[PDB]
Amino acid sequence: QALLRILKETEFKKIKVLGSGAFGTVYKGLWIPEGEKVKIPVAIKELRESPKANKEILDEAYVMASVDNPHVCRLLGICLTSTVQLIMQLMPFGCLLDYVREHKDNIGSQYLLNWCVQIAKGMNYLEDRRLVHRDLAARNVLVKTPQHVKITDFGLAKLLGVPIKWMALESILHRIYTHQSDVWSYGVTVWELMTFGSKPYDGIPASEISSILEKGERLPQPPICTIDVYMIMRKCWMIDADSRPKFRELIIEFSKMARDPQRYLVIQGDERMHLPSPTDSNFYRALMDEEVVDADE
Amino acid sequence: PNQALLRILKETEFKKIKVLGSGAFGTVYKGLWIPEGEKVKIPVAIKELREATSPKANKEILDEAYVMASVDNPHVCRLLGICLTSTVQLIMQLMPFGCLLDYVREHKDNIGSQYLLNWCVQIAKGMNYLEDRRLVHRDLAARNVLVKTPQHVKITDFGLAKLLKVPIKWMALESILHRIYTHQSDVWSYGVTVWELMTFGSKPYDGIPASEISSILEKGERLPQPPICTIDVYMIMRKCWMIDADSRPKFRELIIEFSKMARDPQRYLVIQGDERMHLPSPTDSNFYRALMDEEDM
Ligand SMILES: Nc1ncnc2c1ncn2[C@@H]1O[C@H](COP(=O)(O)OP(=O)(O)NP(=O)(O)O)[C@@H](O)[C@H]1O
Ligand SMILES: Nc1ncnc2c1ncn2[C@@H]1O[C@H](COP(=O)(O)OP(=O)(O)NP(=O)(O)O)[C@@H](O)[C@H]1O
Ligand SMILES: [Mg+2]
Ligand SMILES: [Mg+2]
């Protein structure tokens, strides 16, 4: 358990709020290693408040610390003295939802498909680990670089004790969460990416959602999407959980699509939106990502 | 040499935000890189050469920059980018910890034997790589080893001397006399660098004018045995300073001897409180790597 660093309060300082969610508040922070003059940027999430002892929180944290996948953010450190404060790598680019909105209509097919693949890969790994996210959404995918994204905030929901618009029918009705429910959330997440960050079911009250789903109503096909892409989303949204795609199936399908991106997504000016040149990619990795499917030309 | 390795930056791409220091070749700044079209500001190190350059002169500078950009080793810093402004600027990775010489001075009686020997091994590994590549540093010194993390150091400023007062006190006698530079002369410099670390940052030949160094060297005078250094350690250093270049140790040999010593560090360096001193720990190392050092090492 060298995986999880236990931090003293003196060791770090919250500098500014980056945002807040159902489970807590996230701050840009600095870590000051004892006996050193350096200040290292970090992200701190101070959890919203009942049930659990410090030992139990620690046990859960160890699990969070133990994940090892390029597309999943690993918990790095924890401070338990007052609030539970979780320390993680700070992502300057922020979350994927913010990124897509910011770059609306100016993101390539190659990027969109590759992100779908990456999100699937991280989710599949979580499935391998018998970890259910319970809160997947675009806001919960973090942009390490525009070419590399990572799932975040998994299992917070379990530790602390509501995203209805992202929830699977069964989750809403019976509060049951499973890998297959995560698949429903993935479908919504994909919809967000494809629409450049639109709010799902905008103007529809949370209470209505179950009733509309039961009627067989689903989120609309995004204009950029070919039917094949939309079909994948609809499948994630089937009422019977078992019928939905597996994350491993999803990795395969998106990857295939990624090979001929222009065929599956229709974007004006797509030809000009290709993935970074090797020179640019090498540079990004060196500065930000020391730790991708491509068109078959 | 792979051109994709060196990125050419527009002046508008980056900004200088602080002066880190100055050397014979140039001035080094902390900088921010703003990727075109993005919000983010990414910390970088910029070195701006002292002289203004002709466009003709720069082409030589560029060919050298490509080589500098080609170095691929965990113990050598790789040139990341260049801007051929009126005055040429090199962009590399920022190291918040700074140079090793400053670090040893700052932690002067508080550094353990395990760290010192490990640094020696690491510097040797980086130099061996350069030697393999038929590259001669010409300006090796403790000032020119950067601390990525306390557990990880990298050689820097490779190739600058070639593009460009000389650093007399780190120079082998043949280099002072005839301006002959070789891997074996690099070995001499390595010995001085080891001496700097072992003395926790002492100035070599302090109180002796640089103009008279060759004269003492011909007389057989050498840097004194450091208080913490055992005879076996001092002998390696002395060996680096033989008049006959071919008498000097090979970098490959140095890695082995230092590695062996590192295995039983308290045998080879005798330090007051060495029993007390922090020794790098897996929990600490993981945390540092996740925050600052994701490179294969
Ligand atoms: N590691 C990080 N680096 C940079 N920004 C982060 C990081 N983690 C989270 N954020 C941002 O912090 C803000 C708050 O995140 P969070 O508190 O998790 O709420 P949320 O995920 O948006 N909603 P929720 O589903 O309720 O958790 C969001 O803008 C995130 O994008
Ligand atoms: N990549 C870096 N990150 C942080 N500091 C750096 C970096 N590179 C250089 N520095 C610091 O910048 C300052 C200037 O270094 P430099 O200009 O190379 O002179 P020098 O190394 O002291 N002497 P010399 O290199 O022989 O001319 C030194 O304090 C270095 O430690
Ligand atoms: Mg979140
Ligand atoms: Mg230097």
Swiss-Prot record, chain B:
Record annotation: effect of changing G21C: Found in a lung cancer sample
Chain's role: Receptor tyrosine kinase binding ligands of the EGF family and activating several signaling cascades to convert extracellular cues into appropriate cellular responses. Known ligands include EGF, TGFA/TGF-alpha, AREG, epigen/EPGN, BTC/betacellulin, epiregulin/EREG and HBEGF/heparin-binding EGF. Ligand binding triggers receptor homo- and/or heterodimerization and autophosphorylation on key cytoplasmic residues. The phosphorylated receptor recruits adapter proteins like GRB2 which in turn activates complex downstream signaling cascades.
UniProt entry keywords in alphabetical sequence: ATP-binding, Cell membrane, Developmental protein, Disease variant, Disulfide bond, Endoplasmic reticulum, Endosome, Glycoprotein, Golgi apparatus, Host cell receptor for virus entry, Host-virus interaction, Hydroxylation, Isopeptide bond, Kinase, Lipoprotein, Membrane, Methylation, Nucleotide-binding, Nucleus, Palmitate, Phosphoprotein, Proto-oncogene, Receptor, Repeat, Secreted, Signal, Transferase, Transmembrane, Transmembrane helix, Tyrosine-protein kinase, Ubl conjugation
Location of the protein in the cell: Cell membrane; Endoplasmic reticulum membrane; Golgi apparatus membrane; Nucleus membrane
Organism annotation: Homo sapiens
Main location class: membrane
Residue span(s) of domain Protein kinase: 14-269
Disease: Lung cancer: A common malignancy affecting tissues of the lung. The most common form of lung cancer is non-small cell lung cancer (NSCLC) that can be divided into 3 major histologic subtypes: squamous cell carcinoma, adenocarcinoma, and large cell lung cancer. NSCLC is often diagnosed at an advanced stage and has a poor prognosis.
GO CC annotations, alphabetized: basal plasma membrane; basolateral plasma membrane; cell junction; cell surface; ciliary basal body; cilium; clathrin-coated endocytic vesicle membrane; cytoplasm
Record family assignment: Belongs to the protein kinase superfamily. Tyr protein kinase family. EGF receptor subfamily.
Protein name as it appears in the record: Epidermal growth factor receptor
Subunit details: Binding of the ligand triggers homo- and/or heterodimerization of the receptor triggering its autophosphorylation. Heterodimer with ERBB2. Forms a complex with CCDC88A/GIV (via SH2-like regions) and GNAI3 which leads to enhanced EGFR signaling and triggering of cell migration; binding to CCDC88A requires autophosphorylation of the EGFR C-terminal region, and ligand stimulation is required for recruitment of GNAI3 to the complex. Interacts with ERRFI1; inhibits dimerization of the kinase domain and autophosphorylation. Part of a complex with ERBB2 and either PIK3C2A or PIK3C2B.
Effect upon mutating L160M: Found in a lung cancer sample
Residues found modified as Phosphoserine: S281, S285
Record annotation: effect of changing R267A: Reduced phosphorylation
Residues found modified as Phosphotyrosine: Y288
GO molecular function: actin filament binding; ATP binding; ATPase binding; cadherin binding; chromatin binding; double-stranded DNA binding; enzyme binding; epidermal growth factor binding
Expression by tissue: Ubiquitously expressed. Isoform 2 is also expressed in ovarian cancers.
Residues of the full protein shown: 699 to 1007 of 1210
Site of covalent link Glycyl lysine isopeptide (Lys-Gly) (interchain with G-Cter in ubiquitin): K18, K39, K56, K59, K219, K250, K260
Residues with PTM N6-(2-hydroxyisobutyryl)lysine: K47
Domain of life: Eukaryota
Result when mutating Q89R: Found in a lung cancer sample
